[PDB]
Amino acid sequence: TCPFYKKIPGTGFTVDAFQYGVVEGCTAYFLTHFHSDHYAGLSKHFTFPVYCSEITGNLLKNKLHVQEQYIHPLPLDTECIVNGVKVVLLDANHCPGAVMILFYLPNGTVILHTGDFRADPSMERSLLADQKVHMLYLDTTYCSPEYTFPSQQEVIRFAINTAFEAVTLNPHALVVCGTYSIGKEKVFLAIADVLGSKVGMSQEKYKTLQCLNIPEINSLITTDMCSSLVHLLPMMQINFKGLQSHLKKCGGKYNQILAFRPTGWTHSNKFTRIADVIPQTKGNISIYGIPYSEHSSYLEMKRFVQWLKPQKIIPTVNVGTWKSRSTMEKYFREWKLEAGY
Numbered sequence: 249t250c251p252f253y254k255k256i257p258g259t260g261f262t263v264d265a266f267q268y269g270v271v272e273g274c275t276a277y278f279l280t281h282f283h284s285d286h287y288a289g290l291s292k293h294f295t296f297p298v299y300c301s302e303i304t305g306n307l308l309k310n311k312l313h314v315q316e317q318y319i320h321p322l323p324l325d326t327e328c329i330v331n332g333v334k335v336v337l338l339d340a341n342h343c344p345g346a347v348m349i350l351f352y353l354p355n356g357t358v359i360l361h362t363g364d365f366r367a368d369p370s371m372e373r374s375l376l377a378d379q380k381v382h383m384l385y386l387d388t389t390y391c392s393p394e395y396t397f398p399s400q401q402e403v404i405r406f407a408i409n410t411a412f413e414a415v416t417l418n419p420h421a422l423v424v425c426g427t428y429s430i431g432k433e434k435v436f437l438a439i440a441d442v443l444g445s446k447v448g449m450s451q452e453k454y455k456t457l458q459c460l461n462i463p464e465i466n467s468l469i470t471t472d473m474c475s476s477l478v479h480l481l482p483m484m485q486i487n488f489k490g491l492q493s494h495l496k497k498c499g500g501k502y503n504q505i506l507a508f509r510p511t512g513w514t515h516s517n518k519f520t521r522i523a524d525v526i527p528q529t530k531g532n533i534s535i536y537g538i539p540y541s542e543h544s545s546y547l548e549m550k551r552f553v554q555w556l557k558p559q560k561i562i563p564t565v566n567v568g569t570w571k572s573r574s575t576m577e578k579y580f581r582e583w584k585l586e587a588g589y
């Protein structure tokens with residue numbers, strides 16, 4: 249059965265609710281982004297209308313085989329009528345194709361569902377500037393002050409400089425980057441660009457990247473591993489064993505691996521600056537954990553919510569424990585008393 253925080257009152261609509269079977273009363277199922285916890289349940293057998301971005305639509309058709317007649321893509325930043333209700337889709341600054349959804353309810357209430365997002369000041373000049381929001385359904389992944397991490401630009405600067413240094417000292421080093429979902433593509437794209445290489449990967453991952461409308465993608469990626477000195481591998485293989493095993497396969501072309509594991513936040517964020525990060529090393533293999541986040545920091549989240557001034561907040565992450573729910577409600581009240589709404 250579908251939980252309450254996935255239902256939009258006063259509508260026939262649900263958000264990210266495909267794992268509960270046929271939901272009673274649902275005439276349109278919205279999908280915010282192509283991450284498995286959110287699409288869990290969709291397949292080629294699905295026969296209800298799905299509303300989403302163009303990119304999410306390309307992935308539902310090609311990767312999950314949902315039939316074309318049930319895929320309803322909407323443009324961003326554009327007022328659209330769905331089953332008699334005005335909606336708008338906004339870029340969520342998460343993974344490719346990820347949206348926030350603004351719903352303009354027939355009774356005059358306005359609801360924003362963030363999906364998963366990384367709040368940014370640029371959102372203060374979207375179609376959100378124009379009007380009031382009564383209810384915010386908020387991605388609270390990192391809603392606690394201990395959750396700090398750098399900008400995505402600083403992280404990419406660290407990775408480019410690390411890779412370029414290592415390969416210039418040793419032209420026989422291979423760079424490997426882990427992945428397990430869409431998102432974070434800038435890590436491997438920026439490293440390959442500095443090195444003058446395409447990115448090599450499996451046929452399955454190439455297929456996924458080809459759904460994402462990235463400009464000039466044919467110039468940036470390939471299935472021919474041998475021609476490439478930046479390889480992608482599943483995240484589970486980014487360990488000393490997996491990487492040793494991979495270096496054997498390259499036919500004595502390389503004598504060193506430098507690998508990157510983009511994570512979210514990890515506790516080493518509490519003590520170490522991005523500048524000061526060091527790898528784990530065994531022999532000719534080195535592994536860097538880099539804190540590339542596609543979710544809001546606590547400070548970015550606080551800023552967004554204090555700017556929007558919603559009348560009510562409904563969290564969509566960390567909702568399963570009393571202690572989590574209580575902690576989050578405390579911070580929402582501080583924010584509201586500090587800013588005066």
Ligand code: NI
Nearest residue numbers: 281283342364
């Ligand atoms: Ni996500």
